[PDB]
Amino acid sequence: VLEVITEVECFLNPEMGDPDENLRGFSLKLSAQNDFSSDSPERKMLPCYSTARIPLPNLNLLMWEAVTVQTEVIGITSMLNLHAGSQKVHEHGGGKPIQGSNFHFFAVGGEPLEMQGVLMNYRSKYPDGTITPKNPTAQSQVMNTDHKAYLDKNNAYPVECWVPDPSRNENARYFGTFTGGENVPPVLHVTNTATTVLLDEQGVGPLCKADSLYVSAADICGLFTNSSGTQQWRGLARYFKIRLRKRSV
Amino acid sequence: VEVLGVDAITEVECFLNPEMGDPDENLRGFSLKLSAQNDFSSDSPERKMLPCYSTARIPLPNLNEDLTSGNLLMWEAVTVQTEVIGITSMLNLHAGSQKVHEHGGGKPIQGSNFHFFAVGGEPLEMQGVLMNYRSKYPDGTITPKNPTAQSQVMNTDHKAYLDKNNAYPVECWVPDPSRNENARYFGTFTGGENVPPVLHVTNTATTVLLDEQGVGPLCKADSLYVSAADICGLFTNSSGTQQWRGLARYFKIRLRKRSVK
Amino acid sequence: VEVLEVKTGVDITEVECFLNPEMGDPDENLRGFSLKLSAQNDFSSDSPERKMLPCYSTARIPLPNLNEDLNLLMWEAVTVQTEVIGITSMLNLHAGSQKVHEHGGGKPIQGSNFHFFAVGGEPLEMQGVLMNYRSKYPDGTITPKNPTAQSQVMNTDHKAYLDKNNAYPVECWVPDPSRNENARYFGTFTGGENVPPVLHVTNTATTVLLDEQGVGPLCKADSLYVSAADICGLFTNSSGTQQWRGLARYFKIRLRKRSVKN
Amino acid sequence: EVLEVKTGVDAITEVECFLNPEMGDPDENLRGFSLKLSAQNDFSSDSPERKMLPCYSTARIPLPNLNEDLLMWEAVTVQTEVIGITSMLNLHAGSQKVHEHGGGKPIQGSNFHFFAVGGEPLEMQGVLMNYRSKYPDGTITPKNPTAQSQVMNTDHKAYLDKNNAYPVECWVPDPSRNENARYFGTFTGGENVPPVLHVTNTATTVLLDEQGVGPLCKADSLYVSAADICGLFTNSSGTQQWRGLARYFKIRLRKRSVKN
Amino acid sequence: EVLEVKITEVECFLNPEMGDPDENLRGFSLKLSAQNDFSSDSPERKMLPCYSTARIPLPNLNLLMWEAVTVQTEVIGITSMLNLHAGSQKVHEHGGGKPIQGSNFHFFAVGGEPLEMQGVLMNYRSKYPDGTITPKNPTAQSQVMNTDHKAYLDKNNAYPVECWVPDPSRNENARYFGTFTGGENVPPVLHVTNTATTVLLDEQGVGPLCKADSLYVSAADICGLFTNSSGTQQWRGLARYFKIRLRKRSVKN
Ligand SMILES: [Cl-]
Ligand SMILES: [Cl-]
Ligand SMILES: [Cl-]
Ligand SMILES: [Cl-]
Ligand SMILES: [Cl-]
């Protein structure tokens, strides 16, 4: 990497499971109380990480360096609809707000996000279309160094199976907050005044290999509680605006 | 709206009223009672049940005697002081609100809330997202045209200017982070049945409107745009019915004269 | 008032005040509490009793005139140290409060709270806003005159000076952000049934009262005004009835002499 | 009164201590707990037992003797934290089950975390929930209180001059005095409040005022004060007791020249 | 003692020691008991989470000593708590499983010697099981501060988290950071980022110095309670990653 502008943007859709053509942005209803010895969750019940590869102007070595990102979760006010489908809070009361466990995560890199597998239950039998830890053992419930993967397929890597790998990701920046619990309030902020700098302490940002920029996200907002009492994950899309400059390699 | 050398500062003050629905003449600042449990396939919210974005265009003094000149002057918005007005009104637990228990006081306003403002030199630009794309919205509202299942996530068709007061339902629209190059917007959504409202007042806080290059919103055709949504939470009537409560937002915006090409 | 330089000399006075709260004080024993809260009055017949309504506290601190000939000198407020007094009194869970469960301790004070202070060179300027414009307020209260539905959002008619102690109900009035050019105010409202009180004491915290140009509130008529509201939450009696509980607020204000033009 | 910091050999010292909590200690085995809490006493007949009332902790630390013809020790920094926060992860002993087949109920609810460093005893102001409370022998509480003692009564001034005597519910640090002390307290009230406690040997509180002057130690004595009521322990029966923990202090001091 | 500075990186994933009640429930404790009288409180080994520790040997440089300058650390697998289909009690009829929630402790340390610990007990009369190292000759004063209870974190899976805390009166040659959050319904809140570095230099710019060419990492990451369908509860813990930058420092003999 030697010394030494353009902007790209993306709306990245969430991958919550989409149990039918009308329920884009939701998961299938949650099952409960499967014994660890017989836990076979359906594909459409499992939120997955989102990713997109963004092609950049080819340059000939000059490389695009990501310098800043602006990002926010899109449609947060949609949760002020308490008239459609949600269980009443009490008799004559309005609908129950989306609430409970949530995960808000994004990454910007010059290559796919590197992940480490960890499982609640190693004996989980994951469905076709999902990519999950291979040859899991009891150690897969703590740290098992076999479970390395690239975030190289959209709507494939279940959020519950994978985390950003802090032992890799030399050429990406990632940020995530997990908040667990049945009554957790969603707290989401919007502003066009907030920028994250992507430069390390030596002043270098993600360098885009094969003229490619990779954005990654997961934005599980909480659980939607139907009138029947059934629960579904709700997700929202994440906007990215990335400022890049030419750097000489 | 009070609108008061080359270093001339104009201060624009205004109190923007909330638009929560106002279901009768006595419940200004409240919505109609919330319905619940409408199947997605038959969800027809009443007009007066839907809080909408508040907005106003504030005309500014004309700056340019000669419209033919190489350079023109524009009002540039440099700072805003803002706060929500009448937050103490929620200490009235004697009127209309369900008792917390037998012999107890009234239930405080609480639950999901949204506190949002914008200051720009053109209308706020908005992106539509829906809980439920099959929602049938009522006459008087402006809501995403020809929504699809993709409207429940991101559908780039749904672009609008916040160009009408009490028309754009908060539940359908967010500020568009892909536009608004000539506006600053700030919002926080806090969801949940029991969320406590937390609101601060002080005449000592100022938000700077200058971007990275030190440039504020530039007021196009001498027009300053203020936008707000202040849903404080849900009021619970003795019956158990719930209504949105909103409050007005004050703005004090300082502007200077910028030369442009 | 044209503001000139700070008058330096061999002479920064400090003044201090403990400002008692005005929660309603329903009898001789219940100083610091309101009357039991009523519930479920229809908006059309809402007549709260005076002793049920917390009011803004205010005191005027008199200062010596500085002018040998009626250029002049005014006292300028530079800083304030302030804190809520007796926060630990809520650790009394043996007196009066409803058991949390059988064989358990008393229920803590909790729920909606408001913590507000101001320091000005003149009375606090307030703006009226009502939950219910049809509320019939009791003798001894000063509340918005000729309210309309618009009084439930913003009605610019409702301007008042905080010119009387224990008269302006907290539920009717907020500091006016469109006035108070000669005062600094700070408030946080936290609403809800089960809100925990969170209160900090420290003698290391100073609020600077100086504006953008380094100018504090000026005591135009040789008076300093301190204003407060400290509703800590609701006390729940064994019976189920609820009362507001308030606590006094301490102020210590650093003053200097400021030159101004006649 | 205050001149230059004196440097030289032996112009700096550090002192440390662990101050035990004073939660009431209802028997020889329940050190660090209170007696079970009563409830619903009428204000007119409120007679709390001594062992039910947590009190402020205080200790005097002697410093190397300095000469008066003035040189004084100046407190510059304090490192402090609450000791034994992980003991609350014992959910097997004595605590009511959260539900059938469940673990014990964690300690939770109203808490107060307070410390002070001064060159004289902490100065306190009295405020009462109920001015008619009848406090027990062995406690020092607001003397001859009135209805005003429920808000602010300026008669209630005391020095924190006795360990395990000044009940926390009766007294606060007096912000109108303590010219020669720094204090820091947080009260969080409510039945379900979670304890939140941080430990780290990398956090330092600076005790210097805006002029760069720390507490000055009169007669070569340093005074530490604390209250760390962590919350309520719920027994199997439903009875509740306060739980407190010790507090560590590490105080760095330097010599300061002063003119009497 | 400590003179001029003369760079190497080491990394570790340290497993949690939550009790591991059977070969399938690695990362969990045995179900919690409740309501033992203080006079008859005999917790099983597998029910007690313990501090984790690893010693990392470094090249023998001989004085010159290895000096720990920075640490990046992260709890690993926080998203696994989004599995609400495996084994958790339903929140209500037709509902999803109950999240892990309740009392949690998140702690780490980097030192040039074993972590120095201080013993404090909920109940001094607690009778601890074989394989655990707990306060010796405890008294009622062991429920507050009893200075007898000093120990080195010198063994992995032995020192129960409920018995021991880092000693603020020692650990001159280590840096430690911990937060305890107690309560029935406390929400786990965990952040991941590869952009966060902790500086380990003291006031004089000296990091921990690796006595006998050993670096010591210590942790406890009790995430909260898992509630089984039956109502029984188990602690859940997760591994902690460490990446430590070290430099050579000249010292006097
Ligand atoms: Cl794998
Ligand atoms: Cl549209
Ligand atoms: Cl009026
Ligand atoms: Cl006294
Ligand atoms: Cl020991």
Author numbering:
A (entry chain CCC): 34 to 37, 44 to 99, 107 to 295
B (entry chain DDD): 32 to 35, 40 to 296
C (entry chain EEE): 32 to 42, 44 to 102, 106 to 297
D (entry chain AAA): 33 to 101, 107 to 297
E (entry chain BBB): 33 to 38, 44 to 99, 107 to 297
What does the report in the manuscript say about this coordinate set?
The E73Q pentamer structure was almost identical to that of the WT (RMSD in the BC loop region, from amino acids 68–76, of 0.5 Å), whereas the E73A mutant presenting an alanine in the same position showed some structural changes. Mutation of the initial glutamic acid at position 73 to glutamine in the E73Q variant did not modify the orientation of the BC loop, while its mutation to alanine, in E73A, revealed the flexibility of this part of the BC loop. In addition to GD1b and GT1b, they showed binding to the ganglio-NGL probes that contain α2-3-linked sialic acid at the non-reducing end galactose as in GM1b-DH and GD1a-DH. The two variants having E to Q mutation at position 73, E73Q and VQQ bound, moreover, to a wider range of gangliosides of both a- and b-series including GD1a, GT1a, GD3, and GQ1b. The overall binding intensities for E73Q and VQQ VP1s were higher compared with the E73A and the WT VP1s. As expected, infection was seen for WT in cells supplemented with GD1b, but also for E73Q and E73A PSVs under the same condition, and infection was also seen for E73Q when cells were supplemented with GD1a in both LNCaP and GM95 cells. The ability of the E73Q variant to infect cells supplemented with GD1a was consistent with its increased infectivity in RS cells, which carried GD1a gangliosides. On the other hand, only variant E73Q showed strongly enhanced infectivity in RS cells, which as shown by mass spectroscopy, carried the GD1a ganglioside, and only variant E73Q was able to infect LNCaP and GM95 cells supplemented with GD1a. Similarly, in 293TT cells, E73Q retained infectivity equivalent to that of WT VP1, whereas both VQQ and E73A showed significantly reduced infectivity. Therefore, flipping of the BC2 loop, and not loss of negative charge at position 73, was correlated with loss of infectivity in 293TT cells. This led us to a model in which the two different structural effects of VP1 mutations at position 73 have opposite effects on infectivity: loss of charge increases infectivity, by broadening ganglioside binding, whereas BC loop flipping reduces infectivity.
BK polyomavirus (BKPyV) is a small, non-enveloped, double-stranded DNA virus with an icosahedral capsid formed by 72 capsomers, where a capsomer is an association of a pentamer of the VP1 protein linked internally to a single copy of either the VP2 or the VP3 proteins. BK polyomavirus (BKPyV) is an opportunistic pathogen that uses the b-series gangliosides GD1b and GT1b as entry receptors. Viruses sampled sequentially from these patients accumulated multiple mutations in the BC loop region of the VP1 protein, which is involved in the direct interaction of the virus with sialic acids. All variant VP1 pentamer structures were globally similar to the WT VP1 pentamer with a doughnut-shaped ring composed of a central pore surrounded by five VP1 monomers in 5-fold symmetry.
